Design a binder for this molecule. Structure first.
Ligand code: PRO
Ligand SMILES: [Cl-]
Ligand SMILES: [Cl-]
Ligand SMILES: [Cl-]
Length: 129
């Protein structure tokens, strides 16, 4: 599913991401834009053989099981395919774990490089939230 901007903002808010670990909703929407272009089916192979899945490009080395990332963990206790669903619940639940891991949203390289310190409130402008 390719979410609309406000559509994703609303789903993220409903699932409790607005100000989760202190990060405003616009940060999460911005991260999703640059990680996946709001596409739940996005996948990207990493150099180490792991793969990133879903709207927030969650990695199989630590967070989900894809059956082809030797020595990996599955800290969110889910198949990586669950992160590609039109229902963002699994992605949100797992993202909450990631952002709590100590480095905040810096875990998302695209967020650090394209969102951090910018006017992220712009990402939810106009939305009926
Ligand atoms: O992420 C932000 O910018 C705001 C300020 C602290 C709580 N959320
Ligand atoms: Cl915001
Ligand atoms: Cl694996
Ligand atoms: Cl980047």
């Amino acid at each position: 599913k390719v979410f609309g901007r406000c559509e994703l903002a609303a789903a993220m808010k409903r699932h409790g991401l607005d100000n989760y670990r202190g990060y405003s909703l616009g940060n999460w929407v911005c991260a999703a834009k640059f990680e996946s272009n709001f596409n739940t089916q996005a996948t990207n192979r990493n150099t180490d053989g792991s793969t990133d899945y879903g709207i927030l490009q969650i990695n199989s080395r630590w967070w989900c099981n894809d059956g082809r990332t030797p020595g990996s963990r599955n800290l969110c206790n889910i198949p990586c395919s669950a992160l590609l669903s039109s229902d963002i619940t699994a992605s949100v639940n797992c993202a909450k774990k990631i952002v709590s891991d100590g480095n905040g949203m810096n875990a998302w390289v695209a967020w650090r490089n394209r969102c951090k310190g910018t006017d992220v409130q712009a990402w939810i402008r106009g939305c009926r939230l």
